[PDB]
Amino acid sequence: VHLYQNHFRFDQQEGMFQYKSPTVPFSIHNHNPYITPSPYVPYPDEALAAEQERYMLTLDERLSSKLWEPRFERFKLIENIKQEHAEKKEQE
Amino acid sequence: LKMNFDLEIRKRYASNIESRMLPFCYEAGLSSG
């Protein structure tokens, strides 16, 4: 068993288990070596704020409700289906 | 060809009364719901 900040896993585990289980993010002016640079940057009380954010997130289906533990079930299902199909084809 | 009735029943363990109703309907056999 290995312990981390907010998750843990067994030694031979390829996933993770949460403890609750059973720069400038989202900015288009950021830079990394795989995209072009932006020309707008140099070359490479709280109740009111909460109310404004709530007003700004109106009609946003997925984010307004939230205002997250992936399990990869569809990926595993696709892997299983492909393996079964390959096994069936091997016979013929 | 068919409907995976067992994928919808499991959501019972995931307004509130509406959420709990459909798994019960599918489990009994009420395809209409």
């Binding site: 059973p22 399990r71 | 363990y13």
Partner: peptide, 24 residues
């Protein structure tokens, strides 16, 4: 009951439905 069902679902997801051994 609900806790047991959730734990069983989580374990089945983690183990890929018994195809994977995570305890070794």
């Amino acid at each position: 009951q609900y806790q047991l069902a959730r734990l069983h679902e989580q374990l089945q997801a983690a183990t890929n439905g018994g195809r994977t051994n995570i305890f070794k």
